[PDB]
Every structure is written in C-alpha cells, then in structure tokens.
Amino acid sequence: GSWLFIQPFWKLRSNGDNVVVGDKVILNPVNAGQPLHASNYELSDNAGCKEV
C-alpha cells in the first residue's frame, strides 16, 4: 500500500519527464488507485487538524 505514483498535475509536464522541485504533483496509490486528498473533516481530539 505504500507504493505511490507521482503524476503531473500540470498539462505541461508529461509522463517520462524529470520531476522539478517546486512542481505541483498528484500522488496516486498504486493498489488503491484513488489520489490522496486533504479533506475538510476536522478531528475531534485535535483542534484545527484535517484528515488526509
């Protein structure tokens, strides 16, 4: 489950291109296939922290 695909969030970047620091990317779990997401749900125990 730790395996993750780094994918281009910008159309300019294409598969096989070198990742450049400061570039927005998409992290897709290989097995799950659903990209990570910083949801707006807030944890009850912790204040101001939102689940990923």
Partner 1 sequence: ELDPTTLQKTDSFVPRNSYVRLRHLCTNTWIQSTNVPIDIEEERPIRLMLGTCPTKEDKEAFAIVSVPVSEIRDLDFANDASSMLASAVEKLNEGFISQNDRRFV
Partner 2 sequence: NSVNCNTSWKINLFMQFRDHLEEVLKGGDVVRLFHAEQEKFLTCDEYKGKLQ
Binding residues (CB under 8 A) for partner 1: these are: 10-12, 17-18, 20, 23-24
Residue 20 binding: pick among partner 1, partner 2, none (C-beta 5-8 Å cut-off by kind): partner 1
Q: Does 21 sit near partner 2 (CB under 8 A)? A: no
To the nearest 10°, the Cα dihedral for 8, 10, 15, 18? -80
Residue number, 5 or 10, with CB nearest to partner 2: 10
Residues contacting residue 24 through CB under 8 Å, at least 6 positions apart: 9, 10
Position 12 contacts partner 2 (CB under 8 A)? yes
